[PDB]
Ligand binder design. Structure first.
Ligand code: HEM
Length: 112
């Protein structure tokens, strides 16, 4: 692609002023939010609670697994991560994810 997961994470960490924490990333990904769209209370509403398995969109189409262990080129395109997190941070949480959240979320997702 044009980047590696580590390089995406390092730049978010620099923008956040702090190392990623995958424990916090796992906890934000599984949480239930009430500030965004009603039909998308969690990251897991489409991607599931196990990211090594396929997810599903809101009309039941299949979404390839987020885990790099199941879909290999995950997180190797900086523009793509920013395009999808920009869209779905807003749907689920109601605002853009901050650089610390992005760092924490990718650090957890990159190890599955
Ligand atoms: C804020 C909670 C979420 C997180 C952290 C998250 C994370 C991600 C990431 C990191 C990607 C890009 C993967 C890459 O680099 O290739 C992605 C793609 C995508 N997400 Fe999410 N997502 C979330 C919520 C959602 C929700 C609620 C939906 C359904 C409405 C959704 C649907 C998609 C789709 C359709 C793609 C692109 C398909 C693909 O990459 O195979 N996401 N998600």
């Amino acid at each position: 692609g044009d980047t590696s997961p580590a390089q995406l994470i390092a730049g978010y960490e620099a923008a956040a002023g702090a190392p990623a924490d995958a424990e916090r990333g796992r906890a934000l990904f599984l949480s239930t939010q009430t500030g965004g769209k009603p039909d998308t209370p969690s990251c897991t509403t489409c991607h599931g609670a196990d990211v090594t398995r396929a997810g599903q969109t809101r009309t039941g189409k299949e979404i390839a697994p987020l885990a790099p262990s199941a879909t290999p080129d995950r997180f190797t395109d900086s523009a793509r991560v920013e395009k999808w997190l920009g869209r779905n941070c807003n749907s689920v949480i109601g605002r853009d994810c901050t650089p610390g959240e992005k760092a924490d979320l990718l650090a957890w997702l990159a190890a599955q």
